[PDB]
Ligand binder design. Structure first.
Ligand SMILES: [Ca+2]
Length: 255
């Protein structure tokens, strides 16, 4: 209870810091997305190893081809972690959490950009449109999965595609291997590359994924894009806590 509150007050502070930082550096949004994906996609059921554990901060993992071009995003993460650590009442925040939290703020940024765009670039109105729904209420479960532990080393090599050079079947296999499938692959378009339209053109060439891409394209044309937003959150939520046992009392302190 009191811990539920402490945690959420601590999340508010994190979120305002993330959105203002992302606001100063929007060209890193694709990096933050991919950083959250590539930290998570090492999860391997059989050996219960890998997953969303912050391993990706290790130079040994960061120099892997699949992780090319992610230095700048990881600097933003370090900078933001140092700032969050200085105001936390319940200890430093883990890398695994900040990486997934940077992901959430980047997602929100791409939703806000939609609203603004749908309003003839007018930024003041697009903010009101975005605020209207969210789907801020759909972040509920995601917001509860706060308290991930840090890995102390790189995740094993060889479990993450170089998305940019990958065929769609290498791509489906990655989602399948982690318990997902063609629908999650489609809705997580933005995570795969800096150019979602291009990513989605590639994805529509495989008939298993096609109907999902067309569905989400349709949803993104409606003003509210509710099904795109809700489904992304759902699958991202599953992805961000894989291999992780959440400490529901993390970031707690005397009342
Ligand atoms: Ca990892």
């Amino acid at each position: 209870l009191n811990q539920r509150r402490q945690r959420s007050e601590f999340q508010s502070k994190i979120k305002i810091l993330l959105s203002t930082t992302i606001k100063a550096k929007p060209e890193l949004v694709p990096s933050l997305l991919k950083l959250a994906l590539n930290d998570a996609m090492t999860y391997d059921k059989a050996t219960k190893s890998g997953g969303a554990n912050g391993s990706i901060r290790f130079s040994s993992e960061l120099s892997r081809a699949e992780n090319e071009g992610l230095s700048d995003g990881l600097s933003l993460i370090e900078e933001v972690k140092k700032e969050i650590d200085s105001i936390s009442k319940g200890g430093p925040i883990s890398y695994a959490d900040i990486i997934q939290l940077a992901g959430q703020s980047a997602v929100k940024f791409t939703y806000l950009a939609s609203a603004i765009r749908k309003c003839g670039g007018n930024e003041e109105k697009g903010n009101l449109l975005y605020t209207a729904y969210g789907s801020a209420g759909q972040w509920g479960l995601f917001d509860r999965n706060f308290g991930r532990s840090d890995a102390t080393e790189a995740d094993p090599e060889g479990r993450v595609p170089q998305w940019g050079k990958a065929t769609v079947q290498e791509m489906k296999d990655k989602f399948i291997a982690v318990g997902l499938g063609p629908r999650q692959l489609a809705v997580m378009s933005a995570f795969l590359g800096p150019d979602q339209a291009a990513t989605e053109q590639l994805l529509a060439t495989d008939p298993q994924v096609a109907p999902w891409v067309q569905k989400y394209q349709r949803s993104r044309e409606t003003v509210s894009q509710t099904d795109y937003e809700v489904d992304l959150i759902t699958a991202f939520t599953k992805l961000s806590c894989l291999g992780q046992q959440i400490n529901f009392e993390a970031y707690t302190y005397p009342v």
